Design a protein around this ligand. Structure first.
Ligand code: 8DG
Ligand code: CU
Ligand code: CU
Length: 153
């Protein structure tokens, strides 16, 4: 298993997603994040990746979710810690990896996000902390999942 982060930049009626321009999940919208490095906590990793990919800074993040990901015929698990950045400083800025864009919450193009996102985004937007596991047949196809709400992490 490998540690990753995912940070959703949320304002009362809109979210700043990023169009992944290269790498894993290229061509889909997503939150900002990446691998957690040796020598940083998960949260600091989430903050560093948000700053790097969007030019945005935060005082704090909310822990909102935790989801493990599995691909059929690959033993390597992605242990993804999901944060909400409720309040950001600075100006959204395109990076080599991400082009930030704002979407009003009822207009998020779920068709162009990872397919799991349409399952847990509703929990996110209702402020319900969640735990889950998703097993993908391929990058477009969920084979199996479980998802539940938790009171804390
Ligand atoms: N919304 C969503 N995010 C996912 C899914 N699967 C998945 O790995 N992620 C997130 C976790 C990370 O933010 C990102 C994968 O990390 P990455 O490898 O692209 O990050 P990165 O290149 O920036 O890593 P770094 O080397 O920059 O640290 O995608 C998914 O199914 N849905
Ligand atoms: Cu907050
Ligand atoms: Cu402030």
């Amino acid at each position: 298993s490998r540690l990753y982060t995912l940070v959703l930049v949320l304002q009362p009626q809109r979210v700043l997603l990023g169009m992944k321009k290269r790498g894993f999940g290229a061509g889909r919208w997503n939150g900002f994040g990446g691998k957690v490095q040796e020598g940083e906590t998960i949260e600091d990793g989430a903050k560093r990746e948000l700053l790097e990919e969007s030019g945005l800074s935060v005082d704090t993040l909310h822990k909102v979710g935790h989801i493990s990901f599995e691909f059929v015929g690959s033993p390597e698990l992605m242990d993804v810690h999901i944060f909400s950045a409720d309040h950001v400083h600075g100006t959204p800025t395109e990076s080599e990896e991400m082009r930030p864009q704002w979407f009003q919450l009822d207009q998020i193009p779920f068709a162009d996000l990872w397919p799991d996102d349409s399952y847990w985004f509703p929990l996110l937007l209702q402020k319900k902390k969640f735990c889950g596991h998703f097993k993908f047949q391929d990058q477009d196809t969920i084979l199996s999942y479980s998802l539940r709400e938790v009171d804390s992490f």
